[PDB]
Amino acid sequence: QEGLDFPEYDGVDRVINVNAKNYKNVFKKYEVLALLYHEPPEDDKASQRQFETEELILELAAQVLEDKGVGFGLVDSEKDAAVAKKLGLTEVDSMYVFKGDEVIEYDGEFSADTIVEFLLDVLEDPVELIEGERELQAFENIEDEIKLIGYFKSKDSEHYKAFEDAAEEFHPYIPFFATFDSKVAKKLTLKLNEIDFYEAFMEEPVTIPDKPNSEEEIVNFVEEHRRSTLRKLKPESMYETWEDDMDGIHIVAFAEEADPDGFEFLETLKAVAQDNTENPDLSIIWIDPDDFPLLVPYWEKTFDIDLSAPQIGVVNVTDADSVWMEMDDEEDLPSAEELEDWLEDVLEGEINT
Amino acid sequence: QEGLDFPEYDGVDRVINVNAKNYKNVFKKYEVLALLYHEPPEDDKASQRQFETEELILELAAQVLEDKGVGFGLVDSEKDAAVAKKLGLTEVDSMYVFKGDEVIEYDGEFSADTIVEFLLDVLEDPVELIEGERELQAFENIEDEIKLIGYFKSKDSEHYKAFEDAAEEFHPYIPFFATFDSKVAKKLTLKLNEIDFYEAFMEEPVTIPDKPNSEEEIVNFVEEHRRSTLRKLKPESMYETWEDDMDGIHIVAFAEEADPDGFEFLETLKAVAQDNTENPDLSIIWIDPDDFPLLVPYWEKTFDIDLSAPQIGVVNVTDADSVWMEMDDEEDLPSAEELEDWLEDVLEGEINTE
Ligand SMILES: [Ca+2]
Numbered sequence: 265q266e267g268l269d270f271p272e273y274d275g276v277d278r279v280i281n282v283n284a285k286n287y288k289n290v291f292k293k294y295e296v297l298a299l300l301y302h303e304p305p306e307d308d309k310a311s312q313r314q315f316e317t318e319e320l321i322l323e324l325a326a327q328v329l330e331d332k333g334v335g336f337g338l339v340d341s342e343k344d345a346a347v348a349k350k351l352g353l354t355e356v357d358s359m360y361v362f363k364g365d366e367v368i369e370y371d372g373e374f375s376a377d378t379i380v381e382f383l384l385d386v387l388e389d390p391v392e393l394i395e396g397e398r399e400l401q402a403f404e405n406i407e408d409e410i411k412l413i414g415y416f417k418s419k420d421s422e423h424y425k426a427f428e429d430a431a432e433e434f435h436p437y438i439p440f441f442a443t444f445d446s447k448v449a450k451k452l453t454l455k456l457n458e459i460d461f462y463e464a465f466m467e468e469p470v471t472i473p474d475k476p477n478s479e480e481e482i483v484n485f486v487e488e489h490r491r492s493t494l495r496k497l498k499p500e501s502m503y504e505t506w507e508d509d510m511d512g513i514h515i516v517a518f519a520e521e522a523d524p525d526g527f528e529f530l531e532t533l534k535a536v537a538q539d540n541t542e543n544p545d546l547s548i549i550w551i552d553p554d555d556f557p558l559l560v561p562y563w564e565k566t567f568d569i570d571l572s573a574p575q576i577g578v579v580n581v582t583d584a585d586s587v588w589m590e591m592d593d594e595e596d597l598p599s600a601e602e603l604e605d606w607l608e609d610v611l612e613g614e615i616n617t
Numbered sequence: 618q619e620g621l622d623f624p625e626y627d628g629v630d631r632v633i634n635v636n637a638k639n640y641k642n643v644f645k646k647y648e649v650l651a652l653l654y655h656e657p658p659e660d661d662k663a664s665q666r667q668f669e670t671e672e673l674i675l676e677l678a679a680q681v682l683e684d685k686g687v688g689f690g691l692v693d694s695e696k697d698a699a700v701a702k703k704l705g706l707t708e709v710d711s712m713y714v715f716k717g718d719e720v721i722e723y724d725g726e727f728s729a730d731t732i733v734e735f736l737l738d739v740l741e742d743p744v745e746l747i748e749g750e751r752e753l754q755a756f757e758n759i760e761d762e763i764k765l766i767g768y769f770k771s772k773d774s775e776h777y778k779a780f781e782d783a784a785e786e787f788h789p790y791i792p793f794f795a796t797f798d799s800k801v802a803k804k805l806t807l808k809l810n811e812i813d814f815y816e817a818f819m820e821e822p823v824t825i826p827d828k829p830n831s832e833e834e835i836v837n838f839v840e841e842h843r844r845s846t847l848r849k850l851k852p853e854s855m856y857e858t859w860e861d862d863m864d865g866i867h868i869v870a871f872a873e874e875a876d877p878d879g880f881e882f883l884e885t886l887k888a889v890a891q892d893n894t895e896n897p898d899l900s901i902i903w904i905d906p907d908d909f910p911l912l913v914p915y916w917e918k919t920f921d922i923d924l925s926a927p928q929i930g931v932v933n934v935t936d937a938d939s940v941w942m943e944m945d946d947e948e949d950l951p952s953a954e955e956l957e958d959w960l961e962d963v964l965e966g967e968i969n970t971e
């Protein structure tokens with residue numbers, strides 16, 4: 265047991281209501297402060313089981329992260345509407361994390377381990393250096409998220425400081441990389457002060473134009489390319505992604521990456537997303553069921569599919585109505601051309617929910 | 618919300634005490650039955666509640682898996698000592714999962730999502746087929762666990778049936794793969810009815826000798842090669858692995874695989890593992906801190922290390938005393954030869970916790 269003991273809540277009240285009186289003092293009490301902006305719970309007792317148990321989730325995270333200077337608080341959308349408005353808490357059930365001069369919206373799975381992992385990521389520095397062949401291979405292994413890398417001459421470079429300033433705008437959701445090593449820059453085809461932007465799952469980057477780049481030019485570029493043609497659903501941002509629907513629907517692909525059949529389907533999906541990456545109307549959410557075991561039976565029931573096999577369909581975010589590509593079984597996968605044809609009919613509305 | 622709605626516990630009592638009077642019926646009710654074998658909780662209310670929250674974890678899992686034929690129950694080590702002995706429940710705080718003729722011990726993180734993911738793995742078939750080049754790439758992509766692959770003529774082969782019987786013995790912890798595809802077999806260098814065993818993180822397999830292989834020969838081989846030179850700690854088996862030290866210590870390497878610094882260290886670690894894989898006294902636990910976020914502050918405090926940098930150290934399993942390889946910072950990583958020398962000093966006893 266010694267060397268491996270999960271923490272058990274100790275009953276100490278660490279998460280309290282944050283109101284117009286105490287909010288100035290709460291902030292001075294923590295290096296990083298995360299505020300859950302919530303609606304007052306319903307008068308019925310069944311909604312209290314959901315509210316108390318989720319405050320206890322924040323209490324566990326508060327306990328785990330105490331010695332790292334993190335604190336958690338609750339902000340009532342009615343009782344505290346005034347202070348909420350001044351702090352910038354506008355989305356009910358989001359958790360706003362305050363680090364330095366940035367406000368980070370958490371809109372992901374409400375679970376202690378996922379919240380703690382997210383705060384640990386927030387506490388890290390917003391730029392990761394790349395030096396040498398091994399660290400470069402590490403950068404190149406990243407595919408399931410947007411990434412940026414820039415080539416500068418040193419930490420003191422004025423353009424590096426603008427890169428770091430832009431990095432803080434998207435922390436911790438978009439990893440920003442910098443290299444001062446010319447051999448790395450050579451392999452990446454980076455001229456000095458050039459910044460390459462890699463859309464998730466794309467092998468070919470786009471250089472931000474008009475080098476060198478100020479913070480404003482980077483922030484503007486990223487905001488314009490924020491939605492990848494193929495996105496992976498991730499627990500830490502699952503509701504942010506799900507709320508970003510394409511005119512009422514999502515195209516959802518289920519594939520277990522480690523399974524031979526899921527891998528085979530996933531390769532086809534990546535290849536089709538790469539070949540159609542310039543289509544502005546095309547977005548696909550890849551869900552690996554192994555990332556969301558507690559939702560697998562729900563999904564199988566709601567969608568009437570077998571998640572032991574790869575699937576792709578259209579999901580309506582209003583009522584969870586759905587239509588799925590017909591496959592005989594896990595061996596009956598579509599070719600890249602059959603997948604494109606199905607995606608084309610979906611986008612033309614010929615395959616509707 | 619809609620299409621992305623996590624289940625919340627509904628209050629229905631699905632997990633009950635399983636005892637001499639009802640166990641035969643509980644077993645008959647469920648296709649797959651998971652039994653938590655636990656001591657009676659202490660008389661105070663603090664441990665009485667920690668026991669209730671663990672039962673609520675099983676209640677959520679039971680609710681989520683109800684339609685898949687899975688049930689959960691609780692067996693008291695004192696009140697139900699007799700039925701525990703009858704069923705083979707011996708390790709307090711383990712959960713025993715009954716599928717067909719097998720009894721599968723769960724000794725991993727006690728949380729609803731890890732337990733549900735585990736049971737979903739239990740429900741899967743014990744042998745995965747490989748056909749075609751892309752499924753072969755998927756097989757070759759597996760590295761962080763032991764794996765076996767055999768080449769057979771079809772499922773009607775006696776040797777396939779022996780292989781699937783052996784697979785059931787280790788399900789779901791060691792993935793067994795079968796191919797009937799002679800082109801895949803040629804690419805793997807498998808003769809018909811041969812079985813190759815891949816130790817975790819090793820490029821080159823070991824062929825099980827004395828082809829063709831009975832169930833007993835496969836099981837015996839796997840048991841003798843159960844302990845990889847480099848083993849990744851996983852939530853589903855974390856306590857099983859931690860309780861499996863050889864001599865009183867674990868060599869523990871912390872490395873975040875996705876981080877450039879962790880990756881650089883990890884590649885060195887794998888190289889040293891592969892070069893020293895025949896040393897029977899060498900075994901290293903690789904912990905990726907991102908798999909265990911709720912333990913990261915505790916590890917940092919207990920071990921006096923910074924887990925945003927890679928680390929390797931010796932941990933005594935009796936008193937948690939530890940000693941860590943000294944590194945100036947995350948760039949001061951050892952070479953393969955310096956790691957070897959450090960590991961050699963550990964196994965010689967020069968570097969020790971005492
Ligand atoms: Ca509280």
Ligand SMILES: [Ca+2]
Nearest residue numbers: 371503504507
């Ligand atoms: Ca939201």
Ligand SMILES: [Ca+2]
Nearest residue numbers: 375377378730
């Ligand atoms: Ca989890």
Ligand SMILES: [Ca+2]
Nearest residue numbers: 381384385907
């Ligand atoms: Ca992390």
Ligand SMILES: [Ca+2]
Nearest residue numbers: 425428429432
């Ligand atoms: Ca700055």
Ligand SMILES: [Ca+2]
Nearest residue numbers: 385436437438
């Ligand atoms: Ca991140």
Ligand SMILES: [Ca+2]
Nearest residue numbers: 452453454455
């Ligand atoms: Ca270029």
Ligand SMILES: [Ca+2]
Nearest residue numbers: 474475476477
């Ligand atoms: Ca410019």
Ligand SMILES: [Ca+2]
Nearest residue numbers: 355358371504
């Ligand atoms: Ca949001």
Ligand SMILES: [Ca+2]
Nearest residue numbers: 523524525594
């Ligand atoms: Ca499969």
Ligand SMILES: [Ca+2]
Nearest residue numbers: 524525746752
């Ligand atoms: Ca298959």
Ligand SMILES: [Ca+2]
Nearest residue numbers: 492493541542
């Ligand atoms: Ca695109």
Ligand SMILES: [Ca+2]
Nearest residue numbers: 554555556734
């Ligand atoms: Ca998982």
Ligand SMILES: [Ca+2]
Nearest residue numbers: 525528595752
């Ligand atoms: Ca296939």
Ligand SMILES: [Ca+2]
Nearest residue numbers: 630631632633
């Ligand atoms: Ca119960």
Ligand SMILES: [Ca+2]
Nearest residue numbers: 724856857860
């Ligand atoms: Ca145990």
Ligand SMILES: [Ca+2]
Nearest residue numbers: 554734737738
């Ligand atoms: Ca699984």
